[PDB]
Amino acid sequence: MNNLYRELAPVTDAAWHEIETEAIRTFKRHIAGRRVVDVSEPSGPVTAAVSTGHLRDISPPGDGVVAHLRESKPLVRLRVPFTVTRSAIDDVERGSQDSDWDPVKAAAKKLAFVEDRAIFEGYPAAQIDGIRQCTSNPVLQLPDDARDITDVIAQALSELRLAGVDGPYSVLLSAEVYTKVSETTEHGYPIREHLNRLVDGDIIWAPAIDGAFVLSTRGGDFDLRLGTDVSIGYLSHDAETVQLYLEETLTFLCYTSEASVALTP
Amino acid sequence: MNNLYRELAPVTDAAWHEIETEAIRTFKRHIAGRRVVDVSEPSGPVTAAVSTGHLRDISPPGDGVVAHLRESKPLVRLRVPFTVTRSAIDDVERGSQDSDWDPVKAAAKKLAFVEDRAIFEGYPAAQIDGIRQCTSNPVLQLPDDARDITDVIAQALSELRLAGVDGPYSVLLSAEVYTKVSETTEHGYPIREHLNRLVDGDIIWAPAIDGAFVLSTRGGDFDLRLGTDVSIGYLSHDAETVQLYLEETLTFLCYTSEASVALTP
Amino acid sequence: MNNLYRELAPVTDAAWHEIETEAIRTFKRHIAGRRVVDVSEPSGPVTAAVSTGHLRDISPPGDGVVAHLRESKPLVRLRVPFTVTRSAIDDVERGSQDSDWDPVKAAAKKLAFVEDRAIFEGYPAAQIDGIRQCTSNPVLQLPDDARDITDVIAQALSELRLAGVDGPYSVLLSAEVYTKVSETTEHGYPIREHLNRLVDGDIIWAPAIDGAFVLSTRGGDFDLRLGTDVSIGYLSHDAETVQLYLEETLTFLCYTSEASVALTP
Known part of the structure; x- marks a missing residue:
């Protein structure tokens, strides 16, 4: 198991496939930035910052020494919780084609909007300057x-x-x-x-x-760096519902x- | 023989070929739904219902037992009778190219219209909600x-x-x-x-x-399930006319x- | 995982093996119908209905069209919840041979009785006429x-x-x-x-x-159609107990x- 804990959710393989398929196509239908900026290959969950190559002055540790901090941009983890009904999940295996995935779609839209708004309009708290x-x-x-x-x-x-x-x-x-x-x-x-x-x-x-x-779109101007790309993880459940989320860890540099x-x- | 009983009709192979050709091409000229919805492979005359995957609560068979009926959509059989003259039929083998297939065309139009209206505008008696x-x-x-x-x-x-x-x-x-x-x-x-x-x-x-x-038309949203596709069958004849029909057995799910x-x- | 979610239950492989063995053999000891009727191969969780071959008159979709609905019998899902102690479960791996499976046996008896009564005495809510x-x-x-x-x-x-x-x-x-x-x-x-x-x-x-x-028992008179055969699935657990169930989805036709x-x- 990884941090997503998918294995703990009362969700069948078949339901996972439907949930993933929906998250992805919905996300893709809303997202614009990725169609024009450079999108990196995800570097994995360890990645926490992108080096900018710049130096920042700090006070020296002693006489005759010049010290600079290496500057970098922190990655942000964006997580969008959503809740699906257990009848929607279980119906998939029985052959349902109309299970209610509206919460997935709503979560996917929310995430795409957050991503595109960060890229284009800035997300100051995450230290992203937009275009x-x-x-x-x-x-x-x-x-x-x-x-x-x-x-x-x-x-x-x-x-x-x-x-x-x-x-x-x-x-x-x-x-x-x-x-x-x-x-x-x-x-x-x-x-x-x-x-x-x-x-x-x-x-x-x-x-x-x-x-x-x-x-x-010549390339090299707009850097969307992926630690981990759009993912679906598990939070909790009861008799009637399952609480999941969409998340990604990334940053944007112009x-x-x-x-x-x-x-x- | 199958349920169509084509073999009992006083209709020659040549006339059958003409009637089919006309029915199909006329049908195709009027039909619109099949150009945008998913149309399944006909599953045969046994199919009566399409599983929706859902459960309906019913009263239990005794204490400590929980019962649910499996929901399905019934298929409907649509049949459009039509009558042709036996001189139209018999002339074919004699080299005729203008036998009166107006009744075939009227039937095909009627069937296409009934199918498309069911798909787009619904057919409540057949339990079909249209788009x-x-x-x-x-x-x-x-x-x-x-x-x-x-x-x-x-x-x-x-x-x-x-x-x-x-x-x-x-x-x-x-x-x-x-x-x-x-x-x-x-x-x-x-x-x-x-x-x-x-x-x-x-x-x-x-x-x-x-x-x-x-x-x-991404697929998987609109489901036209064919039990049996458009067919021509035989009912009765007298000295001057033959009564045939067009039929199909299907349903539509959105x-x-x-x-x-x-x-x- | 499938709809049973067995994998989320705090039940060891050894305990699962015991629970199954008990459920099946207890079930078989009480059941009578399956010894005389035709029992089909389970067709899987998608099956919702059994075609009866019959037609029901419905009002036509327009002039000159004759419509009939295809008749089918719906399958019913029968579920019998039961609760076992976690000490019964955990003792198994420790070499215990007298873990309390009374609740499993009570469930199996209850299911067999419900099945047989449906077959022989009917179950009107499930649309089953018995023999x-x-x-x-x-x-x-x-x-x-x-x-x-x-x-x-x-x-x-x-x-x-x-x-x-x-x-x-x-x-x-x-x-x-x-x-x-x-x-x-x-x-x-x-x-x-x-x-x-x-x-x-x-x-x-x-x-x-x-x-x-x-x-x-010449065959072809009495039809027990299995969607899915007797199964054990998982619902919930607390510190001391696990709630499981027995289920099958089937119907009977005479x-x-x-x-x-x-x-x-």
């Missing part, structure tokens, strides 16, 4: 008329190019802007056709964020302030 | 102006995504809406070109339904309330 | 004088024969009648010697029933009303 904080390019305002969205994206692109940043470039849109872009026509012409051909990368569904981002452009809602 | 009853996403209103159809479809897609449901996504349209979508332009630009590229799946001809559906969006006409 | 409801031959009265039992058994056999039902024939006796038959003499001659040679099949110990049955004769006490 919003890291960016050094002029911030752009998303227009009132959806028909002008291609104007601001074009301007974001030129900002990246002028900052000397190679592509390809991707755009992350909030749920609201994504929907507007996908439906809006200008004098009959779908702005999505215009916007799609303008960007050599992808136009990404990013429901966790407000506004939009335009950034390079190495290049000019590789991104933020667009506010 | 319309099943869905838990906000129901959307089709616009008066066809030029706005892409707006509602886009909102529908966003409902599916926000519900954590992966694609691909397909759109089913009533005969009326399909025809409108295929002909309508906004400032000259065909809204079909916009809508077709908006949907990674298909835009489906669904003449049996009113309004529209946008659903995921496992995921959030995998579809309904749009009302 | 008693099924039979169409004249019901016979067991005599006050045990010395006359061979008369009624002989009349019963004659009822079966006249109904055109081939043997071999077996006789099931209540605990009371069995004991009477085994001890009683007429003018010194044991009526058991007469009765045993009169019946080509067996005289069966049936402590679950009152009265008696004489039935054919296909031939004239293949049995009932004799009332």
Whole structure:
């Protein structure tokens, strides 16, 4: 057994497979960051920090000695508890295809939103600066008329190019802007056709964020470090319910302030 | 012989071949559900029920015993009788290529319509809840102006995504809406070109339904279980006509309330 | 793990082996039905219903369509909870041969009695008509004088024969009648010697029933369908006890009303 203690839960192999399958596809349907930042191979549960390579001054241990601390970023463990009914679990083996996995899906959405918000908007208590904080390019305002969205994206692109940043470039849109872009026509012409051909990368569904981002996916700019990737573990149970959780241990680092452009809602 | 008793019908092999060809191709031209739902391999004439995996409380058989009935969905047999003239039948062997199979086509249309309506709109006497009853996403209103159809479809897609449901996504349209979508332009630009590229799946001809559906075809959400697939059997004949029928025995189960969006006409 | 969750029980392999051995042998000592009816191979936890082959009229889905629901018999799950002391459990590994399995035996008796009563006397809540409801031959009265039992058994056999039902024939006796038959003499001659040679099949110990049955075991008349056979699963434990259960999921169908004769006490 590992720290997850799956083996102690009154959950069948079949139910585990359904629960995992749901957590993963739901997580994947909400997550945007992983589609554009570099995602590392999980390094295991021992990992507690990512070295930044920097030195920090501290007072010397004595005369004639110069001391620096090695600086690093701590990993954060994010855990989302959820509760499933034991009838949902047990029904799987009897051949149920509609066991209530809503709590899994809700937990998966919560975790994806937390991850994407950390990456894009910062998580100060976990010492994560988001792309919003890291960016050094002029911030752009998303227009009132959806028909002008291609104007601001074009301007974001030129900002990246002028900052000397190679592509390809991707755009992350909030749920609201994504929907507007996908439906809006200008004098009959779908702005999505215009916007799609303008960007050599992808136009990404990013429901966790407000506004939009335009950034390079050249690599080496945005570091999502995984200690342990999305996992499902066991907490407790009674006669009727099982309490489980989704968790991951990771951090995010932004190495290049000019590789991104933020667009506010 | 099997229950169809085809062998007792005064219908030649040649006529049988024509009747089948017509029934199948007509059926396929009208049917929409089978293009988006999971359609099982026919399990044969013995199958009467589909296990749902669930338990129903019943009063115990004595003290200290706990009893539960196993829940299942019954299959329904749908039979559509039709009558053909014996001159239509007999002309076939004589080289006729215009024998009157109108009654075959009328039966096939009737069966497809009954099947699709059961799938999408439900059939309470057969204990079938259709996708319309099943869905838990906000129901959307089709616009008066066809030029706005892409707006509602886009909102529908966003409902599916926000519900954590992966694609691909397909759109089913009533005969009326399909025809409108295929002909309508906004400032000259065909809204079909916009809508077709908006949907990674298909835009489906669904003449049996009113309004529209946008659903995921990821698999495992919508279950059409075939006992026996569309078949042609024999009832009776007189000097001038033969009474045949089309039939199938099946049921439909919807496992995921959030995998579809309904749009009302 | 499967739905039994045996692995979560604080019960050693040795104790499990003892509990099983006791449950099975106790079960077999009380059960009578399985000795005369057709007992199917367990079909697994997915099975929920047994097709009867019949059709039920339902209102049609529209004009010119004829609809019928497929009839099936639902399986019932019978569960008999029981509690054992943890000292009974733990003593096993220490070499104990008299651990208290009384609660296991009480559960097995309770289950056998519930099964046999369902088979012979019916279980309306589970939609099971027993042989008693099924039979169409004249019901016979067991005599006050045990010395006359061979008369009624002989009349019963004659009822079966006249109904055109081939043997071999077996006789099931209540605990009371069995004991009477085994001890009683007429003018010194044991009526058991007469009765045993009169019946080509067996005289069966049936402590679950009152009265008696004489039935054919030619096969295909009496159908005990097993979803899952007698099993031992785990519910909960505290410091001193473990709550387990016996269960099976099954149903019983009687296909031939004239293949049995009932004799009332």
